[PDB]
Design a protein around this ligand. Sequence first.
Ligand code: HEM
Ligand SMILES: *[C@@H]1O[C@H](CO)[C@@H](O[C@@H]2O[C@H](CO)[C@@H](O[C@@H]3O[C@H](CO)[C@@H](O)[C@H](O)[C@@H]3O)[C@H](O)[C@H]2NC(C)=O)[C@H](O)[C@H]1NC(C)=O
Ligand SMILES: *[C@@H]1O[C@H](CO)[C@@H](O[C@@H]2O[C@H](CO)[C@@H](O)[C@H](O)[C@H]2NC(C)=O)[C@H](O)[C@H]1NC(C)=O
Ligand SMILES: *[C@H]1O[C@H](CO)[C@@H](O)[C@H](O)[C@@H]1O[C@H]1O[C@H](CO)[C@@H](O)[C@H](O)[C@@H]1O
Ligand code: NAG
Ligand code: MAN
Ligand code: MAN
Ligand code: MAN
Ligand code: MAN
Ligand code: MAN
Ligand code: MAN
Ligand code: MAN
Ligand code: MAN
Ligand code: MAN
Ligand code: MAN
Ligand code: BR
Ligand code: BR
Ligand code: BR
Ligand code: MN
Length: 299
Amino acid sequence: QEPGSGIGYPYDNNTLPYVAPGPTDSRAPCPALNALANHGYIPHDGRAISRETLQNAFLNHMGIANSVIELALTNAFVVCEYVTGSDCGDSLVNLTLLAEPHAFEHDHSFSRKDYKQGVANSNDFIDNRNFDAETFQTSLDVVAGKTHFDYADMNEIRLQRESLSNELDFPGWFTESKPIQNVESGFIFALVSDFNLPDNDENPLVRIDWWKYWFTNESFPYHLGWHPPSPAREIEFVTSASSAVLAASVTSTPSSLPSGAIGPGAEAVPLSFASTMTPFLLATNAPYYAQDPTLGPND
Ligand code: HEM
Ligand SMILES: *[C@@H]1O[C@H](CO)[C@@H](O[C@@H]2O[C@H](CO)[C@@H](O[C@@H]3O[C@H](CO)[C@@H](O)[C@H](O)[C@@H]3O)[C@H](O)[C@H]2NC(C)=O)[C@H](O)[C@H]1NC(C)=O
Ligand SMILES: *[C@@H]1O[C@H](CO)[C@@H](O[C@@H]2O[C@H](CO)[C@@H](O)[C@H](O)[C@H]2NC(C)=O)[C@H](O)[C@H]1NC(C)=O
Ligand SMILES: *[C@H]1O[C@H](CO)[C@@H](O)[C@H](O)[C@@H]1O[C@H]1O[C@H](CO)[C@@H](O)[C@H](O)[C@@H]1O
Ligand SMILES: *[C@@H]1O[C@H](CO)[C@@H](O)[C@H](O)[C@H]1NC(C)=O
Ligand SMILES: *[C@H]1O[C@H](CO)[C@@H](O)[C@H](O)[C@@H]1O
Ligand SMILES: *[C@H]1O[C@H](CO)[C@@H](O)[C@H](O)[C@@H]1O
Ligand SMILES: *[C@H]1O[C@H](CO)[C@@H](O)[C@H](O)[C@@H]1O
Ligand SMILES: *[C@H]1O[C@H](CO)[C@@H](O)[C@H](O)[C@@H]1O
Ligand SMILES: *[C@H]1O[C@H](CO)[C@@H](O)[C@H](O)[C@@H]1O
Ligand SMILES: *[C@H]1O[C@H](CO)[C@@H](O)[C@H](O)[C@@H]1O
Ligand SMILES: *[C@H]1O[C@H](CO)[C@@H](O)[C@H](O)[C@@H]1O
Ligand SMILES: *[C@H]1O[C@H](CO)[C@@H](O)[C@H](O)[C@@H]1O
Ligand SMILES: *[C@H]1O[C@H](CO)[C@@H](O)[C@H](O)[C@@H]1O
Ligand SMILES: *[C@H]1O[C@H](CO)[C@@H](O)[C@H](O)[C@@H]1O
Ligand SMILES: [Br-]
Ligand SMILES: [Br-]
Ligand SMILES: [Br-]
Ligand SMILES: [Mn+2]
């Protein structure tokens, strides 16, 4: 928000306004990175981003401590080198390359379509990067009529997404990614669980309106009473949440699940790509911004 607005105070005392991305700006498949870039906490153009810029932006403006993004940073730079064909050092070339499929970006996302979702021919691909309202609605529908949801609800959401993507993706494309997705499940609990409830750290409950605002608007739901978690969330919270989601009892089983869908997931580890391996082409679509309604500087 505008620095004089005080909207982030006393949690964030140095805010910057929302500015929609322009057609030439680079955006990510990540709702968190996109909100940071929309505010200029990382470059508005989404290019040439250092590890420290990311660390500072997450810590000071989202209440997400450095530990939470350590592996994320490693993987971002691994993918940069894979996509561009050379070491990117400490300047992530852009945010868009993070949508390289079957890498860091993965299938059965909560709010994005898959790279070969619903394509008529094996060589087609689609925008697996920008926010997709219809896809997000398939996540939200699992928790329809509710204001909050828990770990067991989240497990049902990710199961529904896996089922849908397994049915809809071009045959042979769909690849399950429980370890990456469920760190992101942990991320959702870390950022938009309701810290105003007394037992948030033991049994965190996602506020659906906060989640929807963050994903749909790629800006922060201060208007709905959200603020950055204080103290900043640490990796233990995230991976514990991740494990808790996957450990939660499934009371509604969708059909068309991949083998081993229900049950614990592997720990996420550094990505690695064969030097021989040619990256898939990136979707070239202009970055998404909210239009219904468009956002002001304080939204
Ligand atoms: C350097 C730090 C980060 C990097 C490089 C990064 C990268 C990515 C990438 C490549 C994806 C796409 C995965 C897919 O859905 O196919 C993604 C998704 C996601 N990210 Fe980030 N991320 C970072 C930090 C964070 C943080 C700190 C949060 C929240 C606290 C966050 C929230 C999410 C969520 C919730 C998704 C899933 C979106 C969906 O499935 O529709 N990210 N991130
Ligand atoms: C973010 O950075 C990535 C990685 O540098 C950009 O993707 C790459 O963009 C280049 C330059 O346009 C593409 O090279 C072109 O390839 C086409 C098709 O083969 C060829 O006709 C041209 O001669 C040119 O060399 C490259 O293919 C592409 N890489 C991948 C894997 O898709 C991306 O455009 C950047 N995005 C933004 C918004 O800045
Ligand atoms: C996206 O952001 C806009 C702007 O903040 C949201 O619309 C506002 O919602 C706030 C509360 O967050 C209300 O006080 C205002 O009446 C709304 N303004 C307008 C122009 O409608 C919108 O709801 C957000 N989208 C989602 C899905 O949360
Ligand atoms: C991205 O641009 C490529 C050419 O620049 C196209 O081959 C791709 O299909 C893809 O096009 C989509 O996104 C661009 C925005 O850069 C639009 O101009 C297109 O109309 C399309 O939505
Ligand atoms: C914001 O400023 C107030 C008053 O100076 C202070 O009490 C608070 O700690 C500050 N917040 C942060 C995160 O530094
Ligand atoms: C989230 O984190 C847990 C614990 O590391 C994993 O079990 C899960 O697969 C996901 O990566
Ligand atoms: C989540 O899981 C990681 C290991 O996967 C732990 O280091 C952390 O304490 C949390 O339980
Ligand atoms: C790990 O941490 C999470 C979040 O605090 C808890 O919900 C879980 O029960 C475990 O203690
Ligand atoms: C990972 O961690 C969660 C929360 O502590 C457990 O529920 C699960 O059994 C696994 O050990
Ligand atoms: C069984 O219960 C779980 C949560 O406990 C729900 O997510 C599911 O929809 C079903 O009612
Ligand atoms: C229980 O819930 C899951 C997730 O919503 C569905 O896939 C299933 O059809 C049943 O309604
Ligand atoms: C739906 O079905 C699966 C097995 O088919 C169970 O694991 C799940 O708990 C639910 O009953
Ligand atoms: C499709 O398959 C699942 C089990 O794999 C069922 O739970 C569902 O009701 C449908 O028959
Ligand atoms: C990580 O592992 C891969 C194998 O997938 C190697 O190809 C790569 O060079 C790195 O050691
Ligand atoms: C997005 O742009 C529209 C232009 O009509 C405004 O209505 C809104 O305030 C926001 O700046
Ligand atoms: Br670029
Ligand atoms: Br409730
Ligand atoms: Br797994
Ligand atoms: Mn995806």
